[PDB]
Amino acid sequence: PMQIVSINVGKPKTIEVRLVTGIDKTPVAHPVAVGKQGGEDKAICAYPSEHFVYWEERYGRPFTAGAFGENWTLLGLTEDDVCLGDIYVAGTALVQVSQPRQPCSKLAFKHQLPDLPKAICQTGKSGFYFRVLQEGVIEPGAPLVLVERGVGALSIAYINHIYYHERDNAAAMKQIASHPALSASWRETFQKRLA
């Protein structure tokens, strides 16, 4: 009971500065190609559907698939159970956990909830990104099968906790920064801190 319950797709837009993808993504009912492409590290944004229950209770309104701008709405995989470096088979694709997802102002504007990013940081209900190790195709309801536990078994919950609360924990940061699966940007941040 670990799966992608929804694959959500958004519309591209250009800004004057480049092409960016919108935070508004709609659930689709058909197969979707999973391609490799900073951009690579954040290829797929994933969010645990379990947390929608909490958000509906906190804010008194619905939260359904796509509500956090996620490509993949997940079932059975929360931040406590998913580790940096975990490799999963999804459809014909292979994906690897690269970093926690940080809360952002686009999400606050989407829901018109200015305290939502703070709440995400306080609760740790953030979701996480995957990089794509092997391109393929997935369908809604696809199982996500763990094929390798990230070395060190460092959970996304643990990594968020160090990043947001233990900014003066040297041993913790060096260790996470040392992980070969960590996104370059998170590595850099842990190396700017630590100096």
Numbering used by the authors: 0 to 16, 20 to 39, 53 to 210
Give excerpts from the publication:
MOSC proteins play a key role in the Moco-dependent reduction of N-hydroxylated mutagens or prodrugs as a final electron transfer enzyme in the nitrogen-reducing system. To provide insights into the catalytic mechanism of MOSC enzymes, we report two crystal structures of YiiM, one from Gram-positive Geobacillus stearothermophilus (gsYiiM) and the other from Gram-negative E. coli (ecYiiM). Based on the comparative analyses of structural and biophysical data, we present the common and distinct features of YiiM enzymes and propose the putative catalytic site that is located at a reactive invariant cysteine residue. Sequences corresponding to the β-barrel and N-α-bundle modules of YiiM are conserved in MOSC family members, suggesting that the two modules form the canonical structure of the MOSC domain.
The crystal structure of gsYiiM was determined by molecular replacement and refined to 2.00 Å resolution. The gsYiiM structure consists of ten β-strands and six α-helices and folds into a triangular shape that can be divided into three distinct structural modules, namely, a β-barrel, an N-terminal α-helix bundle (N-α-bundle), and a C-terminal α-helix bundle (C-α-bundle). gsYiiM possesses a cavity in the middle of its triangular architecture. The gsYiiM cavity holds an invariant cysteine residue (C119 in gsYiiM), which is absolutely conserved in the entire MOSC family. Unexpectedly, in the Fo-Fc electron density map of gsYiiM, the sulfur atom of C119 exhibited an atypical triangular shape rather than a regular spherical shape that was observed for those of the other three cysteine residues (C60, C98, and C136) of gsYiiM. Considering the unusual shape and size of the electron density, the C119 sulfur atom is highly likely to have been oxidized to a sulfonic acid. Thus, the C119 residue was built in the gsYiiM structure as a cysteine sulfonic acid with good refinement statistics. The positive electrostatic potentials that surround the C119 residue would lower the pKa value of the sulfhydryl group at C119, and the deprotonated sulfur could readily make a nucleophilic attack on Moco for cofactor conjugation or on a substrate for the nitrogen-reducing process. Additionally, gsYiiM was observed as a monomer in the asymmetric unit without any suggestive oligomerization partner. In contrast, the α5-α6 loop of gsYiiM protrudes and makes significant steric clashes with the α5ʹ-α6ʹ loop in the dimeric organization, providing an explanation why gsYiiM prefers a monomeric form although the dimerization interface residues of ecYiiM are largely conserved in gsYiiM.
